[PDB]
Amino acid sequence: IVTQTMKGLDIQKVAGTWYSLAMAASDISLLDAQSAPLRVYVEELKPTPEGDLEILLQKWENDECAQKKIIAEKTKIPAVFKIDALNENKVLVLDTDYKKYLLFCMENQSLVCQCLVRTPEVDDEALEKFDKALKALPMHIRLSFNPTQLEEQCHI
Numbered sequence: 001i002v003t004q005t006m007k008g009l010d011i012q013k014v015a016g017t018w019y020s021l022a023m024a025a026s027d028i029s030l031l032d033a034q035s036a037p038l039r040v041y042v043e044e045l046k047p048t049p050e051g052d053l054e055i056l057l058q059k060w061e062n063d064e065c066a067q068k069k070i071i072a073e074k075t076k077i078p079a080v081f082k083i084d085a086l087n088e089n090k091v092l093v094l095d096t097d098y099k100k101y102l103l104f105c106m107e108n109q110s111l112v113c114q115c116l117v118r119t120p121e122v123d124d125e126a127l128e129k130f131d132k133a134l135k136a137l138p139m140h141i142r143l144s145f146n147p148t149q150l151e152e153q154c155h156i
Protein backbone atom coordinates (compact mmCIF):
# COMPACT_ATOMS: atom_id res chain seq x y z
CA ILE A 1 0.00 0.00 0.00
CA VAL A 2 3.05 2.23 0.50
CA THR A 3 3.84 3.74 -2.90
CA GLN A 4 6.54 6.11 -1.81
CA THR A 5 10.09 4.80 -2.06
CA MET A 6 13.47 6.46 -2.08
CA LYS A 7 14.87 6.58 -5.62
CA GLY A 8 18.63 6.03 -5.88
CA LEU A 9 19.02 4.91 -2.25
CA ASP A 10 22.59 4.12 -1.20
CA ILE A 11 22.09 1.74 1.73
CA GLN A 12 25.73 2.20 2.85
CA LYS A 13 25.00 5.79 3.75
CA VAL A 14 22.22 5.03 6.25
CA ALA A 15 24.76 3.31 8.47
CA GLY A 16 25.07 4.66 12.00
CA THR A 17 23.05 6.12 14.87
CA TRP A 18 19.37 6.90 14.53
CA TYR A 19 16.58 8.04 16.86
CA SER A 20 12.91 7.03 16.54
CA LEU A 21 11.51 10.57 16.70
CA ALA A 22 7.96 9.58 15.67
CA MET A 23 6.03 6.39 14.88
CA ALA A 24 2.60 5.67 13.43
CA ALA A 25 0.51 2.62 12.75
CA SER A 26 -2.54 1.56 10.79
CA ASP A 27 -4.07 0.08 13.92
CA ILE A 28 -4.00 1.45 17.46
CA SER A 29 -3.22 -1.97 18.93
CA LEU A 30 0.14 -2.05 17.10
CA LEU A 31 1.60 0.77 19.20
CA ASP A 32 -0.93 1.12 22.05
CA ALA A 33 0.64 -0.96 24.82
CA GLN A 34 4.25 -0.19 25.82
CA SER A 35 4.94 -3.85 25.09
CA ALA A 36 3.12 -3.62 21.73
CA PRO A 37 4.82 -5.87 19.16
CA LEU A 38 5.68 -3.08 16.70
CA ARG A 39 6.62 -0.45 19.26
CA VAL A 40 10.37 -0.47 18.69
CA TYR A 41 13.09 2.09 19.17
CA VAL A 42 15.80 2.10 16.54
CA GLU A 43 19.40 2.41 17.76
CA GLU A 44 21.68 1.80 14.82
CA LEU A 45 21.64 0.67 11.21
CA LYS A 46 24.46 -1.55 10.02
CA PRO A 47 24.27 -2.34 6.31
CA THR A 48 26.35 -5.41 5.41
CA PRO A 49 28.76 -5.59 2.45
CA GLU A 50 26.31 -7.81 0.51
CA GLY A 51 23.75 -5.03 1.02
CA ASP A 52 21.53 -6.51 3.71
CA LEU A 53 20.56 -4.31 6.63
CA GLU A 54 21.05 -5.39 10.23
CA ILE A 55 19.09 -3.29 12.68
CA LEU A 56 19.87 -2.73 16.34
CA LEU A 57 16.81 -1.67 18.37
CA GLN A 58 15.18 -1.83 21.79
CA LYS A 59 11.78 -3.13 22.71
CA TRP A 60 9.85 -3.25 25.95
CA GLU A 61 9.37 -6.95 26.65
CA ASN A 62 8.28 -8.51 29.95
CA ASP A 63 8.71 -5.47 32.23
CA GLU A 64 12.17 -4.70 30.78
CA CYS A 65 13.82 -2.83 27.92
CA ALA A 66 15.49 -5.47 25.77
CA GLN A 67 18.07 -5.14 23.00
CA LYS A 68 17.04 -6.80 19.76
CA LYS A 69 19.18 -7.30 16.69
CA ILE A 70 17.43 -8.21 13.45
CA ILE A 71 18.37 -8.54 9.79
CA ALA A 72 16.37 -7.19 6.89
CA GLU A 73 17.36 -8.98 3.72
CA LYS A 74 17.87 -7.09 0.49
CA THR A 75 15.63 -7.52 -2.54
CA LYS A 76 15.98 -6.52 -6.21
CA ILE A 77 14.55 -3.13 -5.22
CA PRO A 78 17.19 -1.09 -3.39
CA ALA A 79 14.64 0.63 -1.11
CA VAL A 80 12.82 -2.58 -0.15
CA PHE A 81 13.92 -5.23 2.36
CA LYS A 82 12.42 -8.40 3.77
CA ILE A 83 12.23 -9.54 7.35
CA ASP A 84 11.89 -13.33 7.61
CA ALA A 85 8.95 -14.18 9.87
CA LEU A 86 5.75 -16.26 10.07
CA ASN A 87 4.52 -13.93 7.35
CA GLU A 88 6.44 -12.03 4.69
CA ASN A 89 6.89 -8.45 5.87
CA LYS A 90 8.49 -5.72 3.79
CA VAL A 91 10.57 -2.83 5.06
CA LEU A 92 10.50 0.18 2.73
CA VAL A 93 12.73 3.25 2.82
CA LEU A 94 10.41 6.10 1.80
CA ASP A 95 12.89 8.95 1.93
CA THR A 96 16.18 9.99 3.48
CA ASP A 97 18.88 12.64 3.20
CA TYR A 98 21.30 10.38 5.09
CA LYS A 99 22.64 13.14 7.32
CA LYS A 100 19.45 14.20 9.13
CA TYR A 101 16.40 11.97 8.63
CA LEU A 102 15.10 8.67 7.32
CA LEU A 103 11.49 7.64 6.84
CA PHE A 104 10.59 3.96 6.67
CA CYS A 105 7.53 1.75 6.87
CA MET A 106 7.04 -1.93 7.63
CA GLU A 107 4.05 -3.61 6.01
CA ASN A 108 2.44 -7.04 5.76
CA GLN A 109 -3.06 -4.92 5.53
CA SER A 110 -1.21 -3.59 8.57
CA LEU A 111 1.49 -0.94 8.61
CA VAL A 112 3.96 0.74 10.99
CA CYS A 113 6.14 3.68 9.98
CA GLN A 114 8.73 5.85 11.65
CA CYS A 115 10.56 9.10 11.30
CA LEU A 116 14.21 8.49 12.21
CA VAL A 117 16.61 11.37 12.91
CA ARG A 118 20.39 11.45 13.52
CA THR A 119 20.25 13.52 16.71
CA PRO A 120 18.03 13.81 19.81
CA GLU A 121 16.36 17.00 18.59
CA VAL A 122 12.85 17.61 17.33
CA ASP A 123 13.26 18.13 13.58
CA ASP A 124 10.08 19.92 12.45
CA GLU A 125 11.19 19.43 8.84
CA ALA A 126 11.64 15.68 9.18
CA LEU A 127 8.26 15.54 10.93
CA GLU A 128 6.49 17.51 8.14
CA LYS A 129 7.90 15.05 5.61
CA PHE A 130 6.75 12.15 7.79
CA ASP A 131 3.26 13.61 8.09
CA LYS A 132 3.10 14.39 4.35
CA ALA A 133 4.18 10.83 3.55
CA LEU A 134 1.52 9.39 5.84
CA LYS A 135 -1.48 11.44 4.72
CA ALA A 136 -1.82 8.88 1.95
CA LEU A 137 -1.80 6.01 4.43
CA PRO A 138 -4.65 4.89 6.76
CA MET A 139 -2.85 5.49 10.06
CA HIS A 140 -4.82 5.57 13.32
CA ILE A 141 -2.17 6.07 15.99
CA ARG A 142 0.84 8.40 15.94
CA LEU A 143 3.42 8.87 18.69
CA SER A 144 6.24 11.36 18.95
CA PHE A 145 9.01 11.84 21.48
CA ASN A 146 10.77 14.74 23.21
CA PRO A 147 14.56 15.05 23.34
CA THR A 148 14.65 13.92 26.97
CA GLN A 149 12.84 10.70 26.02
CA LEU A 150 15.06 10.14 22.99
CA GLU A 151 18.06 9.83 25.29
CA GLU A 152 16.43 7.18 27.49
CA GLN A 153 16.18 3.40 27.07
CA CYS A 154 12.83 2.65 25.40
CA HIS A 155 12.03 6.39 25.47
CA ILE A 156 10.78 6.29 29.05
Ligand code: RHL
Binding pocket: 014, 037, 038, 040, 042, 045, 055, 059, 070, 072, 083, 084, 085, 091, 092, 093, 102, 103, 104, 106
Ligand atom coordinates in the same frame (compact mmCIF):
# COMPACT_ATOMS: atom_id res chain seq x y z
C1 RHL B 1 16.27 1.93 6.61
C2 RHL B 1 14.99 1.55 7.31
C3 RHL B 1 15.29 1.03 8.69
C4 RHL B 1 14.46 -0.21 8.88
C5 RHL B 1 14.04 -0.37 10.31
C6 RHL B 1 13.19 -1.62 10.35
C7 RHL B 1 12.76 -1.97 11.75
C8 RHL B 1 11.80 -3.14 11.67
C9 RHL B 1 11.62 -3.77 13.03
C10 RHL B 1 10.37 -4.62 13.04
C11 RHL B 1 10.69 -6.06 13.36
C12 RHL B 1 9.90 -6.49 14.58
O1 RHL B 1 9.38 -5.62 15.26
N1 RHL B 1 9.77 -7.85 14.95
C13 RHL B 1 9.03 -8.23 16.10
C14 RHL B 1 9.55 -8.01 17.36
C15 RHL B 1 8.84 -8.39 18.46
C16 RHL B 1 7.63 -9.01 18.31
C17 RHL B 1 7.12 -9.24 17.04
N2 RHL B 1 7.83 -8.86 15.94
RH1 RHL B 1 7.78 -8.76 13.68
N3 RHL B 1 9.62 -9.56 13.28
C18 RHL B 1 10.16 -10.60 12.59
C19 RHL B 1 11.46 -11.00 12.85
C20 RHL B 1 12.20 -10.36 13.80
C21 RHL B 1 11.65 -9.32 14.50
C22 RHL B 1 10.35 -8.91 14.22
